[PDB]
Amino acid sequence: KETAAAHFEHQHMDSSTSAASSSNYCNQMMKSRNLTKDRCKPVNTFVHESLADVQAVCSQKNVACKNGQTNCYQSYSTMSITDCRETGSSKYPNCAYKTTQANKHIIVACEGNPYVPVHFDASV
Amino acid sequence: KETAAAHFEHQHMDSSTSAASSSNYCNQMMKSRNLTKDRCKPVNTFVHESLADVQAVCSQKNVACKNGQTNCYQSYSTMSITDCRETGSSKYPNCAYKTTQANKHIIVACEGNPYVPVHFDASV
Amino acid sequence: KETAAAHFEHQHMDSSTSAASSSNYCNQMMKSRNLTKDRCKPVNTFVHESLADVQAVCSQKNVACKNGQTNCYQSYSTMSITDCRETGSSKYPNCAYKTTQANKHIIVACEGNPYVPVHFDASV
Amino acid sequence: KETAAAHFEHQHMDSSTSAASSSNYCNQMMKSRNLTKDRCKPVNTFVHESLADVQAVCSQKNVACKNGQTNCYQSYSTMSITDCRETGSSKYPNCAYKTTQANKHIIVACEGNPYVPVHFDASV
Numbered sequence: 001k002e003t004a005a006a007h008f009e010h011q012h013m014d015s016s017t018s019a020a021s022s023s024n025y026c027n028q029m030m031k032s033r034n035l036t037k038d039r040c041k042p043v044n045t046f047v048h049e050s051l052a053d054v055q056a057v058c059s060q061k062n063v064a065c066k067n068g069q070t071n072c073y074q075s076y077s078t079m080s081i082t083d084c085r086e087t088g089s090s091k092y093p094n095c096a097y098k099t100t101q102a103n104k105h106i107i108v109a110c111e112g113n114p115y116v117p118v119h120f121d122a123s124v
Numbered sequence: 125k126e127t128a129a130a131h132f133e134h135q136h137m138d139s140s141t142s143a144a145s146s147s148n149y150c151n152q153m154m155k156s157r158n159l160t161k162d163r164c165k166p167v168n169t170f171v172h173e174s175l176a177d178v179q180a181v182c183s184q185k186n187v188a189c190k191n192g193q194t195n196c197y198q199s200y201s202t203m204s205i206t207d208c209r210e211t212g213s214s215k216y217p218n219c220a221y222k223t224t225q226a227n228k229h230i231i232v233a234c235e236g237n238p239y240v241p242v243h244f245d246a247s248v
Numbered sequence: 249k250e251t252a253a254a255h256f257e258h259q260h261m262d263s264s265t266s267a268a269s270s271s272n273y274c275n276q277m278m279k280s281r282n283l284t285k286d287r288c289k290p291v292n293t294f295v296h297e298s299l300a301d302v303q304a305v306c307s308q309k310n311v312a313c314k315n316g317q318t319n320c321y322q323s324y325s326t327m328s329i330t331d332c333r334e335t336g337s338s339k340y341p342n343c344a345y346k347t348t349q350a351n352k353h354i355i356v357a358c359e360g361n362p363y364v365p366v367h368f369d370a371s372v
Numbered sequence: 373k374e375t376a377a378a379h380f381e382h383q384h385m386d387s388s389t390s391a392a393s394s395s396n397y398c399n400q401m402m403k404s405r406n407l408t409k410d411r412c413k414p415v416n417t418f419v420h421e422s423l424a425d426v427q428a429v430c431s432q433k434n435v436a437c438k439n440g441q442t443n444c445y446q447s448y449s450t451m452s453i454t455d456c457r458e459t460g461s462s463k464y465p466n467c468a469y470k471t472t473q474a475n476k477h478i479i480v481a482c483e484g485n486p487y488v489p490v491h492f493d494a495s496v
């Protein structure tokens with residue numbers, strides 16, 4: 001409760017579903033994964049692919065992370081992701097999000113043994 | 125001194141090209157705009173639109189900034205951008221950048237009178 | 249059904265009054281113009297100005313439409329309008345609408361030949 | 373011109389030697405295989421294995437291609453390869469290469485019927 005890798009799948013993995021359907025998505029999932037219990041998390045990406053496909057990004061294109069660290073990797077291919085961006089109104093506790101489905105490259109930080117994602121840097 | 129407004133333009137505006145001409149665009153631009161002076165800026169986005177069109181984003185879709193502030197705005201339209209991301213092997217002061225040209229919505233933070241971009245939040 | 253231009257006239261023009269005469273202006277209008285016959289249209293603005301005046305906006309300030317298209321135009325001058333949202337006290341067909349009277353710049357999408365309004369985007 | 377698989381054979385197979393026999397293997401081979409005709413091809417890998425062994429990789433571990441396509445495959449076993457890279461002082465028409473010999477898993481793109489290597493993607 002809980003490893004960095006577990007924390008990553010907690011915040012960023014949702015393989016239950018293939019894409020985004022209704023704009024209640026982030027609204028509902030941000031609440032579910034305990035992302036709106038203290039403050040409306042401003043931005044959070046969910047990845048709709050197998051855990052294996054996301055984990056494999058750790059052996060693909062090496063790139064610098066946003067903080068300047070160099071343990072980040074961009075997926076070679078597009079992935080099904082849902083970008084969750086808190087709306088301009090939106091007040092805690094009633095957190096509201098603009099749900100946005102897309103097919104972007106993802107960029108994740110990787111570390112440890114096994115060599116897996118531990119943070120979601122960006123989609124591109 | 126420098127106005128945040130002008131600082132934004134310097135770091136993120138490239139109205140002269142409609143797109144990135146080559147895969148060397150970023151390497152060129154990151155140095156010419158002096159963003160690799162003290163450190164390799166890991167991420168920097170350039171916008172290939174008029175200053176008017178970019179400034180106009182300030183009256184478009186209001187959203188939360190990455191830091192949670194509420195003065196951010198997402199363009200209604202996609203815009204021509206170039207994402208510059210530092211390579212994994214890049215080492216200051218010899219900074220190197222992957223280039224990704226794309227049509228994407230931009231998210232800028234706005235403030236002041238006139239009410240204009242002063243930070244580049246994200247592209248989606 | 250209707251041409252695009254005609255549809256705009258029927259839904260948004262009201263040159264027969266200086267303003268909403270009552271807190272239930274929307275409700276006699278949302279009916280009179282068949283906006284509440286198959287539903288309760290959530291939002292609908294009535295412009296208490298000249299059709300020509302409104303059509304002229306198609307040659308004023310070009311601005312990005314909310315949907316990302318770029319054929320939108322903002323009036324230079326303010327216009328008398330009525331904003332129709334519906335009161336909580338409203339389930340179809342017994343429709344009740346929250347009315348509001350104001351002088352705002354309007355934003356319309358225009359197209360065709362002649363270049364005329366086909367959609368009402370926002371009042372600012 | 374040659375067919376995909378044949379191009380691959382002509383570019384990447386050297387089943388006649390077990391390893392680069394000297395520091396100048398690449399210089400002679402890049403010449404020999406006509407890889408310096410119009411330009412100094414910046415990097416090229418020669419595999420010191422039988423052809424069928426390399427083709428068999430098309431049925432081994434499926435991985436993402438650097439271009440992001442999904443038809444790439446990583447070899448279960450390490451293979452004898454020679455890495456050839458332009459040496460810096462290399463200048464067309466006088467190309468010059470650094471020869472590096474190693475045991476690595478190759479990654480190749482495969483396509484067609486029969487499913488055969490048509491592009492060499494990386495050595496890992």
Ligand SMILES: Nc1ccn([C@@H]2O[C@H](CO)[C@@H](OP(=O)(O)O)[C@H]2O)c(=O)n1
Binds near residue numbers: 044119121123
């Ligand atoms: N594109 C983005 C940008 C930020 N984020 C989230 O917001 C945080 C960045 O401030 C990240 O925390 P981790 O990097 O700890 O996952 C990530 O959860 C995201 O999920 N997608």
Ligand SMILES: Nc1ccn([C@@H]2O[C@H](CO)[C@@H](OP(=O)(O)O)[C@H]2O)c(=O)n1
Binds near residue numbers: 167169242244247
């Ligand atoms: N998508 C992104 C992420 C970061 N950045 C740049 O990275 C910096 C740190 O996040 C930002 O500084 P400003 O937002 O102050 O311009 C912005 O310049 C960007 O330009 N595009």
Ligand SMILES: Nc1ccn([C@@H]2O[C@H](CO)[C@@H](OP(=O)(O)O)[C@H]2O)c(=O)n1
Binds near residue numbers: 293294369371
């Ligand atoms: N300020 C606003 C915002 C929306 N609307 C209505 O909202 C509807 C959908 O956004 C529009 O229908 P048209 O697109 O047919 O004009 C428009 O009639 C309005 O009439 N005034």
Ligand SMILES: Nc1ccn([C@@H]2O[C@H](CO)[C@@H](OP(=O)(O)O)[C@H]2O)c(=O)n1
Binds near residue numbers: 383415417491493494
């Ligand atoms: N390790 C690598 C990486 C790239 N390459 C070569 O680099 C070229 C383009 O990256 C490829 O040409 P083909 O697509 O003709 O194989 C491939 O031959 C290589 O031969 N070994």
